[PDB]
Amino acid sequence: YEHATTMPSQAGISYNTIVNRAGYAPLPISITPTKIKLIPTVNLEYVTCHYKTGMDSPAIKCCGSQECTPTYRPDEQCKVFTGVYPFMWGGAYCFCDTENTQVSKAYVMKSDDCLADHAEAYKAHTASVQAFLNITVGEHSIVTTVYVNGETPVNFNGVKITAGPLSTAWTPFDRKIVQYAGEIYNYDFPEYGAGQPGAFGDIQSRTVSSSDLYANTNLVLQRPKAGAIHVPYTQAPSGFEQWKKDKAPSLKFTAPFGCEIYTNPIRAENCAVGSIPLAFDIPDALFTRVSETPTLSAAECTLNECVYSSDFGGIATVKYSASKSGKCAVHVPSGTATLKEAAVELTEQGSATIHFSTANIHPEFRLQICTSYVTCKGDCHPPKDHIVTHPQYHAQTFTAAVSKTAWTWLTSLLGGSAVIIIIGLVLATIVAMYVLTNQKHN
Amino acid sequence: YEHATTMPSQAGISYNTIVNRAGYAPLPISITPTKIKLIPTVNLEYVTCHYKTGMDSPAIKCCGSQECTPTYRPDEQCKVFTGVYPFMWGGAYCFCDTENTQVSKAYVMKSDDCLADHAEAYKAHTASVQAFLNITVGEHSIVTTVYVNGETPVNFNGVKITAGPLSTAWTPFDRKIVQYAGEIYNYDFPEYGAGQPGAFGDIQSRTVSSSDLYANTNLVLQRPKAGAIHVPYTQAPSGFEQWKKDKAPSLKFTAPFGCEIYTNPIRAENCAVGSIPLAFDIPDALFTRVSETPTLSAAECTLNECVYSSDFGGIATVKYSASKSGKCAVHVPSGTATLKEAAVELTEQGSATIHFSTANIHPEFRLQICTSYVTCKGDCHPPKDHIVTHPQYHAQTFTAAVSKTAWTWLTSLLGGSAVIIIIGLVLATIVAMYVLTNQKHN
Amino acid sequence: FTVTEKGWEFVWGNHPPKRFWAQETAPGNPHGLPHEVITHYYHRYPMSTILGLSICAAIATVSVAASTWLFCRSRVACLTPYRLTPNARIPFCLAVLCCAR
């Protein structure tokens, strides 16, 4: 039996329904979503870290001339300095006054702490939604990771459930992503080979153990001080450190719809957006007949408590009579009241006490109990808290809180003016006919 | 300096262009694509293989009764048969006539040859084109893998080249892919848990060593023969073998645009679809002054031979008088005719030979040698081979092969009618004026 | 088989794939004898040639038709007032030109 429904994309809250085959017993279905992930297709480009300007020892020749032999190290600067009279601790190094030669050679390599302290630059596109449902169809419950593409069914007890695709293609993640220290940022990093000095990605190692890194760190060798053996350089500071000093806050704190960004798979959690459709391919064996379930006669519904709070702040009470003692489903077909439980276990002459939730000020819904319909009617009152620490358990219908007094003010001041204009039109018509009757005289 | 150009996506055929800076030397550019890959994002859903119905040994109790103990094996059947009189080689096994009981248990397990003989069922989306170029910009030549998204530049000698994205999102692959033995199939496989017996995917293991397989093979246990210890069973035959028997041919035989499906990773190569835009960021140091290059005076172009074939079938002789002996660029601006070489080395008073290629019967194209512009003009002849084994080196211009005699026939049949109708209209106007003149005397 | 200018490729057995390409050798001669150039551009471009000959014949027919229409109306306009007189003596030069008796 093909049954299609729709579930809102919101974790924690139980979602209840029933299936009414036209001549059989109603089959209750309950789905409570627990954890709804969103895992993009993530593509590593490069990592970066702090650099470490390595320097070779100065090659000194006395009354000679050196040359520049390159090594093709990253950003490998080299320069030959003439007119140098260096000193060691044990006196001067050459005897020649001039024509001595010192060679400075510097290169950029990545830091020793690159392994545990690095930032991963990614690209993300075309995410994949995946929920941890908790389905109960005819008191047979499973807990299964369902995938919410339009296929990939979950099978249990012959029942085939296909939870279709989300109504929205929204993702919190951008086209480019930087991951650093368990937190994830929407940063527009430059491409490989486009890294600029002083900003994020001046070092670009392809992987953590790539052993071939691009480096553009504005390194310039300088002339040594007269009488000293050192290699003086001048370069722009660590762009990774400057990225860490600025760092507009993580996507964990800035994401729309209240998402919960996590790390080891890059994923978002519990983004309250969209809605999941559902397909139920139910076999015919589960449809129990009518007379194998209880069936009421002369039932009546009264409202004990009625507060239009956020949670189950209404209590309806059903006095019933039925010639069996078993459980049967309860359901509200409109979205007027959201019931708490899905079934009520019955005696033969007792009473039932259900808990509902509603946004209405004058609730009038038609409760469906075992196979019948009672009408639960009352008046709800405002709740005592302004602010609660749990979300809403009902749906705000348009014209839900219109408060019959204000229905009377909209009926009188808008329908009464129509009464004024129709009696004016009738009076005008009677006047025109009486003038024509008067001028029938000649 | 931004220089934007567009290259047709086709391997092997060289592409030549020059940058015409208004007061500096022309700068040659030569780009030959070697291998154009096309790689979709590929996601493994399950594997399948031949199966193997595992059987348990029959549990016989002599004059008793047995029960069914489920082992929860895949597609496991357990029927228990009463009224047995089994046999070994050493006579009868039990000694009763009735009330003996035999338990048969069968289950499905994936085959022993699963590792080296199995089909991998993937999902494809969102291709990522990548290209092996060979770039020469002003006798600086590299060979470098490029990524042809609209970024990820290639850097050599200060030139920053970025190959823009493809003008077409065409992929030879469908949404669903099967790999079997180096060959790839657009095949709409059933989802995991949706396998049917006797067809593809009646056995579904999530990975190759997953230790959890889905088996839907229609296994039914039968009743054994009187006086025989065996487990009889009936099941639908293997759907991986039936899929190998069906197997409409691979994607390297049915794909359009000449694509070549390979799988070390799953990719297409050398599809002749679309076109790569290019972006040149040429620095201002490569532009030599005009006066340091050769420059001609009194140059003249004559066509020696001219065949409007598919290869280079035209020889033009350019006689010049050079101010200096050196190599310089030759280029044709239009797609009227495509030259063979990008540079010509000059003497001071020699005559140069260029090889071109045209579709024109009557070509009139303006060559560009070092900085001048000569006008090459002639007539081509039909080739001799009907079918060649190399693709087309030139462009198909609309009205390229009109063969001047047919220009004369079209111009006569299209212009004489207009001449006759305008002299008819002028004659009508003169006749109207002559009537108004002759009626003037009234 | 039909090999076009866009390519063709057969695999025969365990041989490598051979690719073939057609180049422009249409039958006839496009340089004279106008019953030959139509055969050349019909074996060359079949779809274009028929529509081109159709619109050229249509333009020629409509132009000659409207020119003959204007010539006949001009002849009537020149010969009508010289005929509505009861003596009806057209001058000699106009009777030679506009084909009067």
Curated annotation (Swiss-Prot), chain C:
Post-translational modification: Palmitoylated via thioester bonds. These palmitoylations may induce disruption of the C-terminus transmembrane. This would result in the reorientation of E2 C-terminus from lumenal to cytoplasmic side.
Membrane-crossing segments per the record: 50-70
Subcellular location field: Virion membrane; Host cell membrane
Membrane topology: Single-pass type I membrane protein
Cytoplasmic side stretches: 71-101
Residues carrying lipid (S-palmitoyl cysteine): 78, 98-99
Protein function: Plays a role in viral attachment to target host cell, by binding to the cell receptor LDLRAD3. Synthesized as a p62 precursor which is processed by furin at the cell membrane just before virion budding, giving rise to E2-E1 heterodimer. The p62-E1 heterodimer is stable, whereas E2-E1 is unstable and dissociate at low pH. p62 is processed at the last step, presumably to avoid E1 fusion activation before its final export to cell surface.
Subunit text: Interacts with spike glycoprotein E1. Processing of the precursor of protein E3/E2 into E2 and E3 results in a heterodimer of the spike glycoproteins E2 and E1. Spike at virion surface are constituted of a trimer of E2-E1 heterodimers. Interacts with 6K protein. Interacts with host LDLRAD3 (via domain LDL-receptor class A 1); this interaction mediates viral entry to the host cell. 2 adjacent E2-E1 heterodimers in the trimeric spike interact with host LDLRAD3.
Official protein name in the record: Spike glycoprotein E2
Source organism per UniProt: Venezuelan equine encephalitis virus (strain TC-83) (VEEV)
Residues of the full protein shown: 653 to 753 of 1254
